[PDB]
RNA sequence: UAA
């Protein structure tokens, strides 16, 4: 009974393509991160503007492009999981992706494989667009394409194409062939470093022309051996086809084989190359020590631009070094084959490592200038501009896609709210905790603060006495006359904001009644104030010029430059227009006749070009017309122009909140749900028109206007990018009960056009240029009124009459990825700490501790000091480890203390555990326990150490007040066996040694003695404790469940997992009175197991019951236990897990009834709704199931009637309770908003 | 506390089972039983196996750590006459 | 004292650091400093399975009393190797250091077979008198079946859930036992003459039996009737095994000098038919890498095979692996140590090859140059690679 | 031809009154207590 | 108090 949700979406870019997918007006950049396909429009200056994002239910293994007849757009080949192809097309009519066909190959692959399949299949596409092949391990799946869209597929072993093909290394389609010719790189006899002396030149290379004969039933393929090469170096791993041949990339060599099939030349890259073994052709010897040690080398082959002889190939190793390879062939023969390292003067590529894909953005018919998009596994994905590809080269950074790299550690601490007072007033996000993760893998490695809410910069704070709403007036582009009103007392003050908000006390403004609205008017020459029952027009000096009396009190009033819209309690509309000549007239505006015979819940004056098609002589993609927009009680959005004749338009489908909206004439059951709407521009640099809908239940719906065909608004339902803020059917009434939610638009917050939603829990709508708009929690205090302030600032008033000016922090913040992300650079230009890991937070001292891990060259030493025999000194060495501990003060994010561990030492685990230092008095102290494992070879005996640190307050060094804490080592000990994990149990700490776990306790005199002992099968991967219950992960045999006792110290073996898997992380999923465990596999599976001693076949609980398996889309690096926030309802907990792709997930345990309801809803969505890539979400996670909250979120995005019909499937009141527990899951992470 | 959630005294449904089997509980530092006697047997305690106190097995009254238990090769299990607890001062050198 | 230790703890540290950081397992280069980049055997699949080849002779062990060793068995976690002797004794040997001496005296007659439970909680051992003993992991005999078979027990294999286990003897029948009560369940009738070995399918209910009547039979444990017969062996069929992990394959050796691998998913389809001039005596599938197995011959000559590399010849032959006929093979469950026992009364341990090794594939196990004590320097060496094979 | 009680801890040996330790002959007996506990633990909720 |  669990539900899985993605706290963060993936950030590591794995694939990229340039094509015409959604439009042919420009070449888009398709970006795949883990399961999200992002379509970007690359600008001329390298900025990436997101067009639309699609989220899939499986891991996108590979992407490919195939053209289609009678269409300029190209279809998309999507590879998901293991051996699955879904052909994707973009439906321009529906602005969505519809799957052309599914192709399952895993079953055939297993049928034709003696050994287990590889986790990732590899897709190759014919340059002639005639066929595509997918191969896993010597089994090739061919997907022919007709020239009725896809011919039947044929799956065969590589031995059927060519007799000798036995261990395929790589397959590629060769170029300049009239038939779909492929090249196979294979090793009939497998050879590695320890096998080279007894096996010479094992790699082979064959060129096969394929004669695909599609038929109605099956496809027949015949391969003719064009050429065959028998003697090749063992380390060749990547085929890089070129115009006249193919470059074979190896760990130590670069072999060039032409399409004729003769190895014309080869380049030795390092000292490990096959020196004096090839000895049959041109041997370009290079002492550059270039190492392509990866399984597959990333590269881009740019064809010759028409031919200018400018065909370029760029290799790129794991350390982000771009290598230029030139092939100055005059024909079949090759001349001047060499590899050149591109000089990088400004080390802009230092922060990035493990490149994944390279794509050229803008062609410009010349290979001299190239704009390259490169995705990285650790650093930000970059858009680089290469200027002069020479054998003066210049490289500049145009833009970047934020990448939280591999989240290798997750902890909770205070990043904000350290100080309870900010500029006199209390901290707006006081007592708010945040997830802090470790990001990156090398020189560029930082702390990523996964903020639960937006932290605004305060530049002004003041206390008011009694207000309910405020307005700030800008007359000469400057702040004057900050009007405040008190609805309870019917008062209105002036508060001239030029000088310390002093009481102006001047002008005939109505001080003795509640102001409903006041703003500048008449091109900043008039001030209009709408009171409870009167409308007043003033000038800059607040002199009365016009007065209008309203019979009924006004409710909603909106103002544009020449017009004002007023709604009164009777429900009828009143629109006034200021006279242009000398103002002070306020003429009436004739409403449409049909308008007065229908109820309007809210209205506003709107400026947009959406209905320009229906207007007379206005069918231009410009000139936003003035529209008087109104929300009817039937939730219908209607609008008309000033010269409306009698025509009223309407957004169709908004009453049911349909996926697609469109403008049409409004021709004519009061169920008012839509509370406020507004259409405005959102974005940072390019502004996109969005329709934002506020419902009476507090939920916010966003519709994107299509830039082409502007009369239509579309909402992405597959993408779960918009956070849930409320529930329709009066569920979660506390979200809107205290403070009424008002949506305020600010075109310039810090250069961002944002939307502010007031209430007890405020929200801000921020849209990055490379991302969709996101709903972000704003602060941790209620917001009552927000007004623009100066330029690029706002003033916000909370519920306790405290007003403070805010500005959006944009220095290291990324307002995308479903949650605000703060980049904390720990390494500076002086001290370059390498990859940071094992980040902990010391609660008592309010400090963060992290461990750096510098990769140093490894020297293999024996047990005696003497070195191991086979050492070579004048040769590149494998990287060892060297680690230490950094004490970081979150006040300044500076390292205030550092301690270093010796060579060949990696801190495999660090904790901030509470340790019982006295068994009698039960005194507990928070110690930092670091588990150091000596990362060395298999032959040397395993060794390690554990250090216990106490954070002590010291006298700060003058100049730096934050250096008032230091690390004091109260105990350390070198122990036999690697210390792979550290965990605290019941006030005592347990560390893992080689096939051993020892429990020790600390006395008052800082004496540490082991008290318990338990044997471990192979290797401890993770260990967690729940009071006195242990779970110890094993690298081969799953995990086991241990209870710990004291007086008679015992390690009771309560149970263990029945299935043996290589677990990555462990955590407890308590789920009420029962007890479950979460175990992440090396196959990206997370398993839920329960301790069920009362079950029959559990052997008194010794056999853990396997509850569910759930295939995550990336490997899990870490898990943590977090308290769970209960919005309506014994403490409850949740699991938070960091992923390598940069995504954060959570498992929320559910009760039986909640699980039943949500399972029924999820099954209904899967069975009835149309999935994006045709992928069944149930089957994708199964490579009592764990529920995918991404599927359940589609319930929130359905139509109202569709929502009711789906909820009716099981439960009369299932809609209400379903919305309640969906809210509970969505807000389960808000326990960080209330702490200490 | 969000940093160190209170997971010590959690109400578990298998706690009575942990009392019956393994003589275990969720409070490692619970007071010793004033009625239970290891030599007399489980019947000495009036509250029976469901006693909130600690019922020390006779295996833990032994004076010297079992050398075969340390290697995981003790053939006598709880019937051994040597200590099956990782007590360092009680080891035979 | 300083000695040759083979521990996979540090390689696992490196592997999990790579996996938790998204770093790929970097290609090992022919240099000693790259031994740190050699991952634990469980981390290697596909073309990297060649790294998990035991080719470096690492240690040579022997009991105080030179007794014939009918069977050896690693503990299910690979911590220790159980060496059964012809005198009915159990000798343990720690995998960390290949060091232990204290005996157990398990049975009264020669222990012919041992087998641990898949749950790793129960070991059953059979002897030459037909007695079957059930052992706890701490080696505390808990149950005897005095007359499980009339003749000497030949082979015993547990079911997937370890609730049942099948045994065979010099009698012409196999009988399935209920482990919970130790009571015989049914008799697998057939197999004229004598049945020499048996094995249970790792996943589903399927029994393979090798017999002196030139037959390999497939049984249904639920019913106890033969479901298919293999007629492809021209003499008595010796030890037969399915596979440790998947069981899609089934291998049986016979003393007609032929080893055959069958695809059980395709009506016992023949995959490999490798013949040798010398007699095969035992086999051992690789515990991690499918399609990889080792054959032991009557003249020593460990022969490691690979279904995907060569269907006709071994991918690696260690011709003088043992001085006499090799009786039992046992891969460590972790997969980093390979243990072999022969009639020369010696236990020899094999580890994976090193990136660079002057004596690689030139040990006295590869060239018949075993002069007096040739393993003294290969068993007392603290390091592994060693300078360029011989010893005092 | 006659064995000695090497690893047997003298409590699973009863005097027969084929294997002997020091003089008087004994025989190994199953520890019919660990097997019984296994049986007890095989019971539901026990 | 040993196997
Ligand atoms: Zn008691
Ligand atoms: Zn003992």
Numbering used by the authors:
A (entry chain A): 1 to 147, 193 to 351, 357 to 441, 496 to 772, 777 to 1237, 1241 to 1294, 1305 to 1357
B (entry chain B): 2 to 94
C (entry chain D): 28 to 415, 419 to 422
D (entry chain F): 207 to 223, 240 to 268
Study text:
Most eukaryotic messenger RNAs (mRNAs) are processed at their 3′ end by the cleavage and polyadenylation specificity factor (CPF/CPSF).
In this map, we identified an additional density, which is not present in the previous maps of the yeast polymerase module or mPSF (Casañal et al., 2017; Zhang et al., 2020), that extends from the top of Pfs2 toward Yth1 and Cft1 (orange). Given the resolution of the map, we could de novo build an atomic model into a part of the additional density, including a region of Mpe1 downstream of the zinc knuckle (residues 207–222 and 240–268). Mpe1 residues 207–252 form a small, compact fold that packs against the Pfs2 beta-propeller. Mpe1 then continues as a helix (residues 253–268) that makes additional contacts with the side of the Pfs2 beta-propeller. Two aromatic residues from this helix (W257 and Y260) insert into a hydrophobic pocket of Pfs2 that is lined by W149, I161, and F206. Surprisingly, in addition to the interactions between RNA and Yth1, A2 is contacted directly by P215 of Mpe1 through a CH-π interaction (Levitt and Perutz, 1988).
